[PDB]
Design a protein around this ligand. Structure first.
Ligand SMILES: NCc1cccc(C2CCN(C(=O)c3cncc(CCc4ccccc4)c3)CC2)c1
Ligand SMILES: NCc1cccc(C2CCN(C(=O)c3cncc(CCc4ccccc4)c3)CC2)c1
Ligand SMILES: NCc1cccc(C2CCN(C(=O)c3cncc(CCc4ccccc4)c3)CC2)c1
Ligand SMILES: NCc1cccc(C2CCN(C(=O)c3cncc(CCc4ccccc4)c3)CC2)c1
Lengths: 242, 242, 242, 242
C-alpha cells in the first residue's frame, strides 16, 4: 500500500495473506474470505503454472504479519482458465480451504457486489494489504496491515491515460472491460498487495469491487492501479462457491 | 544464447547490438540490418513507452562487444501500434539510422522472407546474439557473439506444449499466429538476445524468419523460445522500409 | 544464533537490541544491561568511526523484535581507545542510557565476573541474540530472541584450529589473549548477535564471560566463534560503570 | 583506480592481472612482475586461507582486460607468515610462475627500492590497475588499464588523519610502520586494484614504493590509500627472489 495508514484492528475482517513454504512461511499475496470456506485472490499469485498444494498456506486477518500465525491448509486451487498474464485479463482465482472458518466479529466474509454495480468516480473506496509502500520499497517490520482510500477512474478514461507516452494505438485497449482502475500518484496498490481487495462502501455496506492485479509501477504519473473487476466474474465465482 | 558456440567472424554480417546511454554504452538488445539504413528489432526493446532517441546508439557487427565500438545515431524509432506486451504480440520495431550504412562483405543486410514462407519443422535455422548463456547467467567477457542451431516447431504444437503444466485453458491461445517457436531444453535464445535474428537457410538464402521475443525462461522443459513471425508483419515493415 | 532455539520469556533478562534509524529503527547488534544505566556491547557495533547519537536507540528484553518496541535514548558512547578492528582486539564498548532503567523481575542487569574468573572448557555456557541463523540466512520474522548452549574451547586449542587451512604462521597468534572461544559447526553466534552476551553459570550464578565479536563465518569447520574476554576489560569498565 | 585515466600502451610493462577460475577466468586483484619468474602482490588477495593453485592464473600486461588473454599457471604461492588481515599488517605475497617470462619492451620487470629509500611528503607517484573507478562503481568494459598520479603522505601525518572523527586512541596507530600512504579525495586506488603497484620515479628509475592494500573506502575525506611498504619487506622477498 502506497500512502494511507495502518488499518484499525476493527477494519477489514475478510483480509487474508497467502504464504509460500520456504526458509519460513513467507507472505507473497493477499486475498479475501468471501465464504467461510473460500478465499478470493488474483490468478497471477498462483499461476499460470500449476503449483504444489503442500507449499501454500492461508493466514486470516492479522494486525501485524507473522506475529500471530495460525496457518490454514488448502485442498484446491481453482484458477480461471482464461488466465495467462494480468495484461491479457481474467486475473482471478479461488482457494477452497481444507476446512471452513468459524466466523467472528474480527473475522468474517466480504460481500460480493450485485451484478450491476459499476463503482463510478466519487465512491469511497479502500484497498488494503501488506505489500510494498512504494516502488522497490518494502513494508518495514512489524508489518502493519495498511489501507488507503483510492479514487475510482472510469475505464475508458484510464485506458486513454495508459496510452499517454506510449507507442500503442489509441484504438487498442490496454485497460480491458474485465478490469477496473483506482488510485493516483499518492495513493496506490503495490507488489505484495496483489490478490487482495478493493472495497467500496455502497448503501451502508462494503462491496468488493476488485482484486489487486497490475499496473505500470505504483503511484506513478498517469498510471492508476488496475484491478480485476469482480462483477465480470461472478458467474465463474458462483460455479464454485455457494 | 543457450548452448551453441562463439560465431565465426564471417558469419552473420547483419547482426547488430542496441546500446543505451549510461556509465557506458550498454548492450540491452540485439537487432538486424535489413536495409543500409534500417534496423529491425523487437518492440519490447524500445517500448511500449516512448524513450529518448538521444539515449540510443546502434553498433554494427562486432566480434566482441565493447571491444571496438563505432556507435551510430538513430533518427527514428518506429513501433508497431498493436504492441503493449510480448505475450499479447506485435512485438516488432524499426530503427531508422541517421545515416545509411556502407555495406561491405563483413557487414550487410539480411534478406526478408516472402509472405508465403512458413519455415516448417526440419529447416536449418540459427539464432544469434550476446545474451545470457542460461537463465540468470550472463555472457561472460570478452562478450563474444554466440550462435546456436534451433529446431523449429509448428505453432499449434508449441502452443499446446505451453499448456502442459499450466492452468490455462487448452482452448485459450498462449502462443499466437503472429509468433513462431523454436529451440529445446539445450539450445535457445535468452535475455539480452531479444530483438535479434532467427535465420533459416531456404533454398540457398539465409532469410530472417523471426525476431527473438519471449518465452518462459530459457531452455526450460516444454517451453521453446518464442519469436515474432516476420512474414506476418511484412506489410507493416514495407510501409516504412523501401 | 546458529542452532539452539527460541528463548523462553523468563530467561536472559539482560539482553538488549541496538537500533539505527532508517525506514524503521532497525536492529543491528546485541548488547547487555550491566547496570541500570549502562549497556555493554562490541566496539565494532558502534565504531571505530564516530556516529551520530541521535541515530541510536536501545531496546530492553523483547521476546519478538519490533513487536512491542520501547526505544531508549542514549547519552554516551564509550569505545575502548585501543579499538580499530575486531581481529586486532579490544572489541568492547559502553552505552550510557539517558536515564536508569526501572529494573524489574523480567528485565534486569547481568553480573560481571571477577578478574580471576577463567571460564574453562566443559563449562555450561550460552549465547543469545537475534542474529542470522546461518551464513547469509537472516532470523526469519517474527524474529524471536534465540539461544544456544555452546562449548568453550581453550584459547590455544582454538588458535590451533584457526591455523588449519591457513597460511598464517603457527607462531603467529590469531585468537588473541583478550579473546575467548566457544562454539562448533552445529552451534554458534552469527552476524546480528555481535555485542550480545555469552553467559556462564558459575556456582549457582550467571556471569558474563564475553561479548560476541567475530570469527570466520558461522558454524564453519575449524572456526569457533570468538568473543571479547570480559575479565580482560574490567578496569576499563569499572572506570565508567559505578 | 579513482580519477586518472587510461594508461597509454607503452606505460607500466610490469603490471599484471590475477585471475580466479569460474564461469570465466575472472580478474580479482592486480600484481607486478618483479622477476621474469616472480609476481609481487598483496597477501589478502590470496590469503589467509590457502588457495587451490589449479584455480589461479596470471595475466601479463593487457590494454583491455579479457580481450587478448594469455593465462600463465602458477607453481607456488608464498604468503607472508605474518599475514592475517590488512589492518594487522604484512599484506604481501609472491606467486612463482611455472615458467620464466620472455621479457621485452612491452612487458618486463619493475625495480624494487634499496633498503633505505624513503619517498618524501608529496612525490610524483603513480598507482595502476583494473579496479573500481569509485566506491561501488565498477570499471566498465572494455576494462582498459587505468593510471592515476597520487601524492605521498608521511605516515605520521596519515595516521593522524585516520584518527580524525574516530574513537581509536591518538596513541594507538592505525597506519603502521610497514605501511605507506598515498592519495587524496580525488585520486586513489580501489577494490580490484589491491595487489598492484605504486611507483615513484626517483633519479630516472621507476621504483615500486608499495602494494595496493587497503583503506576506509576509496578517495574519502581524511582517508588516504594505504599500501604495504615494500622496503619494509625486501629481505623476505629476496629470500625467494633472485
Ligand atoms: N499499483 C498497481 C499494482 C498493484 C500490485 C502490483 C503491481 C506491479 C505489477 C508489475 N509491474 C509492472 O510495472 C509491469 C510488469 N509487466 C508488464 C507491464 C506492462 C507493460 C510495460 C512494461 C515496461 C514499461 C511500461 C509498460 C507492467 C510493477 C507493479 C502494480
Ligand atoms: N528462451 C527465449 C527467450 C528470448 C529472450 C528473452 C526471454 C525472457 C522473456 C521474459 N521471461 C519470462 O519468463 C516471462 C516473463 N513475463 C511473462 C512470461 C509469461 C507468463 C508466465 C509468468 C511466470 C511463469 C509462467 C508464465 C514469461 C524470461 C525469459 C526468453
Ligand atoms: N560465528 C561467530 C561470529 C559471531 C558474530 C559475527 C561473525 C562474523 C564476523 C565477520 N565475518 C568474517 O568472516 C570475517 C570478516 N573480516 C575478517 C575476517 C578475518 C580474516 C579472514 C578473511 C577471509 C577468510 C579467512 C580469514 C573474518 C563473518 C562472521 C561471526
Ligand atoms: N583506497 C585504498 C584502497 C585500495 C584497495 C582496496 C580498498 C578497500 C579495503 C576494504 N574497504 C574498507 O572500507 C574497510 C574494510 N574493513 C575494515 C576497514 C578498517 C576499519 C573500519 C571499518 C568501517 C568504518 C571505519 C573503519 C576498512 C574498502 C576499500 C581501499
Amino acid at each position: 500500500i502506497v500512502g494511507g495508514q495502518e488499518a484499525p484492528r476493527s477494519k477489514w475482517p475478510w483480509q487474508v495473506s497467502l504464504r509460500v513454504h520456504g526458509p519460513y512461511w513467507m507472505h507473497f499475496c493477499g486475498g479475501s474470505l468471501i465464504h467461510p470456506q473460500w478465499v478470493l485472490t488474483a490468478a497471477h499469485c498462483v499461476g499460470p503454472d500449476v503449483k504444489d498444494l503442500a507449499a501454500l498456506r492461508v493466514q486470516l486477518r492479522e494486525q501485524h504479519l507473522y506475529y500471530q500465525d495460525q496457518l490454514l491448509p488448502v485442498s484446491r486451487i481453482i484458477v480461471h482458465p482464461q488466465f495467462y498474464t494480468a495484461q491479457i485479463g481474467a486475473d482471478i482465482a479461488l482457494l477452497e480451504l481444507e476446512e471452513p472458518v468459524k466466523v467472528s466479529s474480527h473475522v468474517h466474509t466480504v460481500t460480493l457486489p450485485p451484478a450491476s454495480e459499476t463503482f463510478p468516480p466519487g465512491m469511497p473506496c479502500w484497498v488494503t494489504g501488506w505489500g510494498d509502500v512504494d516502488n522497490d520499497e518494502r513494508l518495514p517490520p512489524p508489518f502493519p496491515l495498511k489501507q488507503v482510500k483510492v479514487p475510482i477512474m472510469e475505464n475508458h478514461i484510464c485506458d486513454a491515460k495508459y496510452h499517454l507516452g506510449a507507442y500503442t494505438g489509441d484504438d487498442v485497449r490496454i485497460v480491458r472491460d474485465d478490469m477496473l482502475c483506482a488510485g493516483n500518484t499518492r495513493r496506490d496498490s503495490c507488489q505484495g498487495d496483489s490478490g487482495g481487495p478493493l472495497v467500496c462502501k455502497v448503501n451502508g455496506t462494503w462491496l468488493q469491487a476488485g482484486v489487486v492485479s497490475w499496473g505500470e509501477g505504483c503511484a506513478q504519473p498517469n498510471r492508476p492501479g488496475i484491478y480485476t473487476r469482480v462483477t465480470y466474474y461472478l458467474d465463474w465465482i458462483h460455479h464454485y462457491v455457494p
